[PDB]
Design a protein around this ligand. Structure first.
Ligand code: LMT
Ligand code: LMT
Lengths: 211, 221, 159, 159, 221, 211
């Protein structure tokens, strides 16, 4: 089986600079290599085939070259929507193989997150459990640290986070943290705080509420 | 008009069999080779099987040969994929792709969004949608935040829209997370002008094909 | 050898299929592993006015993909391939939207290396296109001709 | 399939050469070691009215000589070969002194086994003969054709 | 009109080279492959070399390859054979044959009488004819026997006729024999009515082309 | 090289019976075998080719069959002129090879020979040697025994025989025996006898003469 190794696996570049991803085959595959682009929940798009032929409807800033074993996908004027995972695929012999892929996020100027906090909906509490939700809206980088303090008491394994994909426009991220607690334990206290720390914040922001 | 829409995906039990179908449009189906590519949860792309325009030439991957059978119907513009004796390793998003030439070319200029196939033994469970009411902090820039909380369902996926697809700008549906109960939980929020929380109605609609249950929940202040 | 007048290189671009082919010597096309049994797939015009060509041909028990560059010359529809022997390509005729006819010869032996082909945009059998091909061939010393089927075009190296 | 009327078996006897041949399927003639790539050499009419045929064909990396008997039937210029598949031979036309045109098909698959040939008395290229051959072929689904040279005819299995 | 006439044969010395030629007529020379076949004294047939109608394809026997070269001139309808560095083993009657097809077919429907090529260091020698006088036993059935003795000649052949070809009936020319002197000896007899040994004259005429000497000898009682 | 082995090497049949000659190849030669006919001092004739195809102008009584390794030439109504040497040749591979040949003579009713004896010609004696000639005219079979007795004394290695070919008409043979002696030795004696014995003679016939 031909093994395709892409490189780098993930990259961060400012909108505007030129990026280059490499792909190497475990053996010569002629010029039979293609480049696909895939975004979250969307249909992959064919960018390059035959190593350097550009699929119709694809901006000229995408280019491809290489031969034998080493191939390369180049993106000139990086745009905010060029964010995605790029994959190379060979079709010299069966099975057809893909590369592990390269994840490209758009570098952006640091942006503090707008934190919000949502109390458990009475409809939910009338079931047996309670979900406390905290929202970090529009920020960068993706790295953010969220903490749950009930009555000024830390928490662990009682909350889970989920991050959106990098906005195709503002190139920012959004995160959600959900704290789970039994309807009874929720009653045992009343001071629920969501302390968030980010590179865009000189000091931890804490949004809270009381039953 | 050119597009590829796959369907058939759902929850399937180990050993059972499921049939995936891909509907084509906007081009001349019989003039292009078709292929199936899949992607296991949080993993890279993986080629599954290919078929020529006539369908007389097919090709499979060893990990699926003997179990999967590719086929096509040049009348209804449909591409099929028969998955028999499904293993756990078959859980993935099955993508439908169109080759540039009549044969299994190797490169595909048209793809579909894919269908998620989850092979497990657990039972299907419809979620519970809870409103994420706009806190009194709705005066944070003149724009209030609000959303929904679809909790405890299985398997995936679960689509979520706002005001029946009308409300798009500002919507942020979060990737589902696997809860310690083995069930999935997700959340979806949206930003709107707080100056419209009195005349405009905001309702999220969640559909869980597996559980075969559609739901409408309003998010009021 | 009486080739088309001016040719619009910009319009022959895109996908093509090798429907039929002929040569002056049987050995040229006889047996799939022939030295002139090539299959055109794509025609990509370059800015400098040249024409890149994506094709397939048998080579040591395996179909191989190759990218060739036909450099334009001081002759209308005549290009040249930098490969050895100095193969010359001549575009006999083309409507741009359906068919295209060309021949290729090696300056070294312009008697035992003349192959011609009939290309088409869609993987269908264009009877009218083959017609113009047969007509343009009745004046050449072809001693072998081949024509393919839609199913055969589904093969990188034609069934 | 519109074959010659009454044929004078007694006059087709003698030496012949296979000048040109065509088939409905490329594979039938493609590559010298083809299943229908035979070469007529002699036609010897038997007393019972049948026709013995001396020919050559490739077989396991070697040219082989074979004697076949085409039995006359209740049809004018149509004979039959007792070999498997039941190959039928049809004489399309002939002047007896210069050329002769025939085709052969296998009853089993009368769609993927139709080969025709243009024979000649002398080892020379008869343009007029080839003409009548091309003419009688423009109505058949031939997807491969081969023509030989005087020098190639000097080969038991044609160069 | 169809015939093949070879020539060029004679006495050749070991190591020298000779050129044989074959003249054709009655058919289209260039339309048939030609071949040389030889026959060593009192031995069977032996193929030597073949050539196609065009002459672009020739073939030789190992025992002669490198020494013999076959050729043809399609203008004068002539077939050639160049014999260089002739060994003793080359002594034979070289026959000219015509193939049924244009290439070296393998079988030949037309042959020539052949030419004798004798390779020796021996010198040509004319024979000596002696009369075989009718013994007094000429009264053995009323028919007496008489003939000639052509002794010591080389090489061969040596034709013998009676009364200049007029006397045929009863003539018996014996095959030549190789004498211990390396020279050839032959005898030729005829039976005639003893009742004519007084008015009829019987004379044998021997010709030895090689020695270039004709001879007339009378056989009297 | 393919070796062709014909059989028999020589045969005698009566005009009328059917004769069969075999030919075997050292290896399979398909059906590429031909049969030639050759008569003394005459141009060989092609009889059969392709193992069984009958050359034009050849009587139907000649036939040929065989395949692979064994082939056979059959002659039906044997005629008096069918006498000759038959050869088989293969043309499957080079070098083309012939068979050792089969010599076929025609059978006939026994016929006694007419013996004659010729004294050495004085012209010859006037050289140094003398040749005594004895003639056996028109006889059959070919087998005959000749002896030379000088003064009632046997001889050995002093004479040589030569036989004619079987007459195309009477189917008979003629033999000649020549006794060689130095002109001196010829003088040393005077009684020269030629004693001939043949199946057609109840007793040896002796013709003689004296110097
Ligand atoms: C409408 C546009 C049409 C465009 C058509 C373009 C056709 C381009 C054809 C390129 C053909 C190249 O064809 C190839 O040339 C090389 C020389 O360079 C030949 O020679 C090559 O292979 C032979 C063995 O077979 C080697 O001994 C030799 O050293 C090697 O160079 C190949 O045998 C021939 O198959
Ligand atoms: C004027 C009248 C002229 C009449 C001429 C009539 C010609 C008739 C020709 C019949 C020729 C048959 O020719 C023969 O066909 C068979 C298929 O059926 C081919 O195929 C056969 O041999 C090959 C091996 O060589 C096997 O792998 C195959 O399974 C077997 O069927 C032979 O390779 C081909 O030599």
């Amino acid at each position: 089986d031909i093994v395709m190794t892409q490189s780098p696996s993930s990259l961060s570049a400012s909108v505007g600079d030129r990026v280059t991803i490499t792909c190497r085959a475990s053996q010569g595959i002629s010029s039979r290599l293609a480049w696909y682009q895939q975004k979250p929940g969307k249909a992959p798009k064919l960018l390059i085939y035959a190593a350097s032929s550009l699929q119709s409807g694809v901006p000229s800033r995408f280019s491809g070259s290489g031969s034998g074993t080493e191939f390369t996908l180049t993106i000139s004027s990086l745009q905010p929507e060029d964010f995605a995972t790029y994959y190379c695929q060979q079709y010299h012999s069966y099975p057809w193989t893909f590369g592990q892929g390269t994840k490209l996020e758009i570098k952006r100027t640091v942006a503090a997150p707008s934190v919000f906090i949502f109390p458990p909906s009475d409809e939910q509490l009338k079931s047996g459990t309670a979900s406390v939700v905290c929202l970090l809206n529009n920020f960068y980088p993706r790295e953010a640290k969220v903490q749950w303090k009930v009555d000024n008491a830390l928490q662990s394994g009682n909350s889970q986070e989920s991050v959106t994909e990098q906005d195709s426009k503002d190139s920012t991220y959004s995160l959600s943290s959900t704290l789970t607690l039994s309807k009874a334990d929720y009653e045992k206290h009343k001071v629920y705080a969501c302390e968030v720390t980010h590179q865009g914040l000189s000091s931890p922001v804490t949004k809270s509420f009381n039953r | 008009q050119v597009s590829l829409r796959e369907s058939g995906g759902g929850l399937v039990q180990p050993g059972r069999s499921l049939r995936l179908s891909c509907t084509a449009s906007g081009f001349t189906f019989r003039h292009h080779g078709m292929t199936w590519v899949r992607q296991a949860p949080g993993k890279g792309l993986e080629w599954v099987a290919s078929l020529s325009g006539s369908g007389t030439k097919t090709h499979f991957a060893d990990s699926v040969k003997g179990r999967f059978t590719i086929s096509r119907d040049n009348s209804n513009n449909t591409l099929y994929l028969q998955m028999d004796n499904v293993r756990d390793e078959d859980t993935a998003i099955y993508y439908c792709a169109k080759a540039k030439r009549v044969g299994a070319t190797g490169y595909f200029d048209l793809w579909g969004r894919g269908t998620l196939v989850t092979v497990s033994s657990a039972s299907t469970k419809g979620p519970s949608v809870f409103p994420l009411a706009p806190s009194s902090k709705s005066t944070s820039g003149g724009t209030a935040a609000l959303g929904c909380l679809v909790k405890d369902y299985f398997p995936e996926p679960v689509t979520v829209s706002w005001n029946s697809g009308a409300l798009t700008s500002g919507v942020h549906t979060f990737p589902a997370v696997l809860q310690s109960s083995g069930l999935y939980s997700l959340s979806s929020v949206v930003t709107v002008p707080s100056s419209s929380l009195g005349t405009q109605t905001y309702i999220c609609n969640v559909n869980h094909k597996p559980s075969n249950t559609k739901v409408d929940k309003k998010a009021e202040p | 050898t009486q080739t088309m007048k001016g040719l619009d290189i910009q319009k022959v671009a895109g996908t093509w299929y090798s429907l039929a082919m002929a040569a002056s010597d049987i050995s040229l096309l006889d047996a799939q592993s022939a030295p002139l049994r090539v299959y055109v797939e794509e025609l990509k015009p370059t800015p400098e006015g040249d024409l890149e060509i994506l094709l397939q041909k048998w080579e040591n028990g395996e179909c191989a993909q190759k990218k060739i560059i036909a450099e334009k010359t001081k002759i209308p529809a005549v290009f040249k391939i930098d490969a050895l022997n100095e193969n010359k390509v001549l575009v006999l005729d083309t409507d741009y939207k359906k068919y295209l006819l060309f021949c290729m010869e090696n300056s070294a032996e312009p008697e035992q290396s003349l192959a011609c082909q009939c290309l088409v945009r869609t993987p269908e059998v264009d009877d009218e296109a083959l017609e113009k091909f047969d007509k343009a061939l009745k004046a050449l010393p072809m001693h072998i001709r081949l024509s393919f089927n839609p199913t055969q075009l589904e093969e990188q190296c034609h069934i």
